[PDB]
């Protein structure tokens, strides 16, 4: 359950990054999605997830997301991704 959950989290993160390209009403729905994923992470408790996410999305997006997370950093990677999503949801508008 967990591994496909991280797959869908990364896939919908890339999709929401694609949807918020015009925001550089979707901010409120994005904040609801981030709060939903944060609640799911509260209920439960990235390079190796390449194949599942790229089966879901045949576009490489993936190299942008990994570069943004590695610029951010420079059980724990999940926390880093959720802090990244909340930080983007703060500056959405």
């Amino acid at each position: 359950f967990f591994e496909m959950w991280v797959t869908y989290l990364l896939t919908e993160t890339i999709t929401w990054k694609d949807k918020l390209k015009t925001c550089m009403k979707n901010c409120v729905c994005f904040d609801k999605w981030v709060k939903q994923k944060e609640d799911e992470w509260n209920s439960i408790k990235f390079e190796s997830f390449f194949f599942h996410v790229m089966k879901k999305l045949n576009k490489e997006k993936w190299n942008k997301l990994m570069d943004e997370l590695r610029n951010k950093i420079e059980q724990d990677a999940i926390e880093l991704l959720l802090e990244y999503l909340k930080e983007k949801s703060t500056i959405c508008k």
Partner: antibody
Amino acid sequence: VQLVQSGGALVRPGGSLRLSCAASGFDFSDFEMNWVRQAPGKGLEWISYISKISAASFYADSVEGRFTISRDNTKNLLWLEMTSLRDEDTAVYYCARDLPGYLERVFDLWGQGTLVSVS
Amino acid sequence: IVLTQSPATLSLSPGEDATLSCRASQSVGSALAWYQHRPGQSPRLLIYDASTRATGIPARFSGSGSGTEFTLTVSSLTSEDFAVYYCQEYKNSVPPTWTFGQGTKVEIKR
């Protein structure tokens, strides 16, 4: 469709070597690349993978930190920069092409082979 | 995932059918491939989903298996079918693994 490698070379232990794998007959940007290693009398053993772009690069557990796979999808060359070569890396290095589909992680078409021997 | 080629060396006459095996330590699925390392030549892909057939491969190369037991059945052994056959899992787990078998071998019996 053809994958032509660089040919074997003799290298001292602790040294460096740059393999090459020039592909022809297809689109290099549309295919994931692989490196497969065969020691004498040991069998086949995957060591490296690179994606269509350099977004993903995977290594075997015995080769992490030492080897580096890189590709040039406008010159159709796949490299494997080799660093800190031990005595167990005397082997034949094969350059493999992966099928379309990121789930189907197989090795479709292979190179000519490259006997790397250390002394 | 640990892959075991039980047949190993196989003394068989040419023109006959040869069955093989590739036992996985874990439940993989249909994510298993088969290879043929002919002597003096590069390996080639035969089957890539433990049941299918790769492009450029004759119909005598057939396989089966969807759990932990896998089997490649090659029929009417020609001169180039006496090779070393490998089986590779590509299971969609995290981290991804590319694990071969030891290599079963088909040889001419006398």
